Amino acid sequence: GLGGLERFCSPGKGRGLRALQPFQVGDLLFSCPAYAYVLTVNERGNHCEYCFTRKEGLSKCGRCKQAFYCNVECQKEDWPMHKLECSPMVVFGENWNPSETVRLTARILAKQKIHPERTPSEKLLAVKEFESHLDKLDNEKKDLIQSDIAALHHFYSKHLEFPDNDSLVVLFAQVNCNGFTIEDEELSHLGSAIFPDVALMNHSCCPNVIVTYKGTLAEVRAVQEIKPGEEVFTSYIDLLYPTEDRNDRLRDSYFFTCECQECTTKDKDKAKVEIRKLSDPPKAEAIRDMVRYARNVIEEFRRAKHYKSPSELLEICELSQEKMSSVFEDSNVYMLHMMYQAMGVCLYMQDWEGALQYGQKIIKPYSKHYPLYSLNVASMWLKLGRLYMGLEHKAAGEKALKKAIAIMEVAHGKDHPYISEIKQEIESH
Amino acid sequence: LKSKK
Numbered sequence: 001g002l003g004g005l006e007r008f009c010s011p012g013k014g015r016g017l018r019a020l021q022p023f024q025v026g027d028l029l030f031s032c033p034a035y036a037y038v039l040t041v042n043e044r045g046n047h048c049e050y051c052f053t054r055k056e057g058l059s060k061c062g063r064c065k066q067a068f069y070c071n072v073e074c075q076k077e078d079w080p081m082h083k084l085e086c087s088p089m090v091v092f093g094e095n096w097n098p099s100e101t102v103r104l105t106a107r108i109l110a111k112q113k114i115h116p117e118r119t120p121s122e123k124l125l126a127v128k129e130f131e132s133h134l135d136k137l138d139n140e141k142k143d144l145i146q147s148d149i150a151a152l153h154h155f156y157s158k159h160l161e162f163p164d165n166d167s168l169v170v171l172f173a174q175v176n177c178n179g180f181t182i183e184d185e186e187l188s189h190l191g192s193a194i195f196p197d198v199a200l201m202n203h204s205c206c207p208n209v210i211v212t213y214k215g216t217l218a219e220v221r222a223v224q225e226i227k228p229g230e231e232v233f234t235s236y237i238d239l240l241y242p243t244e245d246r247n248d249r250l251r252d253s254y255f256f257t258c259e260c261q262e263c264t265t266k267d268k269d270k271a272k273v274e275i276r277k278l279s280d281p282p283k284a285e286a287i288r289d290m291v292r293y294a295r296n297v298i299e300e301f302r303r304a305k306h307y308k309s310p311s312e313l314l315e316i317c318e319l320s321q322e323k324m325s326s327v328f329e330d331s332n333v334y335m336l337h338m339m340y341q342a343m344g345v346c347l348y349m350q351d352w353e354g355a356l357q358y359g360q361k362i363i364k365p366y367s368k369h370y371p372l373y374s375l376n377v378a379s380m381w382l383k384l385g386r387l388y389m390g391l392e393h394k395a396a397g398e399k400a401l402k403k404a405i406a407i408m409e410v411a412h413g414k415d416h417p418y419i420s421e422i423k424q425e426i427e428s429h
Numbered sequence: 430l431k432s433k434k
């Protein structure tokens with residue numbers, strides 16, 4: 001197992017992770033090497049395929065020209081996994097498009113063939129023991145898993161000996177339930193991975209730990225004091241949202257309803273959905289209509305980013321914020337969601353001034369809605385600092401970068417390479 | 430997948 005911790009039966013939460021020793025804020029509970037992992041297509045050339053090191057001058061795989069490495073060692077060590085995609089990418093060419101879930105699942109199957117025994121990533125929970133929620137799957141979810149199974153056979157039949165369709169549905173369901181996205185210091189998606197021992201941790205909306213990444217290594221650090229006998233909880237989702245939104249996401253992706261202190265009390269829901277203090281106060285039904293509109297625009301924008309122009313996308317943000325502002329305060333989470341999306345469009349267009357303009361409005365309400373140590377808060381301070389620094393606003397940049405560092409020292413560890421990079425940014429300018 | 434953003 002893992003020193004100072006143990007697997008146990010958490011009443012109403014299946015299996016969980018329990019502390020057997022105290023942990024203070026910022027302490028590393030444990031580390032978990034990735035069981036299986038895949039670098040996202042859009043990050044190829046930026047990060048090494050094998051170790052996820054972000055560096056310039058990465059060496060290109062000579063055959064496919066679509067995998068990049070630190071050196072010949074990272075190339076060689078990645079070959080058992082890379083071979084699943086190398087020749088297929090050149091052969092299928094433009095037709096090579098498996099989903100990231102399919103790409104990850106092919107790597108799980110390859111790992112099971114090479115290393116059928118328990119790995120150092122499975123000291124407490126094994127990939128084979130993962131919860132699947134197979135019994136909870138409706139026709140729509142089974143059809144999506146069937147599309148994934150067809151893509152797996154379509155792109156990965158060369159090296160893999162597939163189990164029956166039934167075992168593959170269980171696997172795809174286990175991956176959807178237990179898979180992790182690996183994000184960088186700005187919360188930008190790097191890839192997907194399996195961290196079995198990390199997946200043992202149950203969810204809370206008031207977590208006592210944060211998961212961070214050092215290359216492909218998951219690290220688990222306390223963000224609250226943990227005492228012997230206490231269960232170790234991480235957040236599976238974005239904590240900005242009110243109770244109903246959080247539980248709609250938890251039910252849809254994880255098939256459960258949270259009953260943590262935040263979900264039971266609903267204490268933060270009022271400030272999250274802050275209403276304007278108007279002479280004629282807005283009616284209950286008028287609030288409910290705007291909350292419904294707000295959730296609809298969030299979905300509309302999500303679809304629109306796949307095909308609309310940057311000006312059309314900014315229009316959706318501006319127009320929706322205008323409609324919402326008649327009922328909602330600027331600190332309201334639905335207003336903040338659109339501002340964050342608008343900031344993202346500005347960043348893509350390299351409109352640094354516009355991105356800064358939005359980030360300045362988001363920061364104070366973010367700090368209030370998110371927990372004490374939050375990667376979403378750290379990431380926003382970091383973006384702001386980098387924008388300020390890039391725009392020659394050095395004092396404001398330094399202040400915002402130091403706010404990012406203060407949170408990251410707890411979540412990522414004082415010695416994290418990301419913090420050394422941020423300090424170099426403060427020192428170089 | 431289990432994330433922040």
Ligand SMILES: Nc1ncnc2c1ncn2[C@@H]1O[C@H](CSCC[C@H](N)C(=O)O)[C@@H](O)[C@H]1O
Nearest residue numbers: 012013014015131199200201202203254256
């Ligand atoms: N706060 C919570 N309340 C109820 N169930 C939870 C929970 N957090 C996590 N889970 C359960 O754990 C699954 C994610 S995997 C976490 C380990 C799991 N308890 C197990 O025995 O394997 C969820 O889809 C859900 O079934």
Ligand SMILES: [Zn+2]
Nearest residue numbers: 048051070074
């Ligand atoms: Zn490398």
Ligand SMILES: [Zn+2]
Nearest residue numbers: 061063064086
């Ligand atoms: Zn290759």
Ligand SMILES: [Zn+2]
Nearest residue numbers: 205258260263
């Ligand atoms: Zn909760």
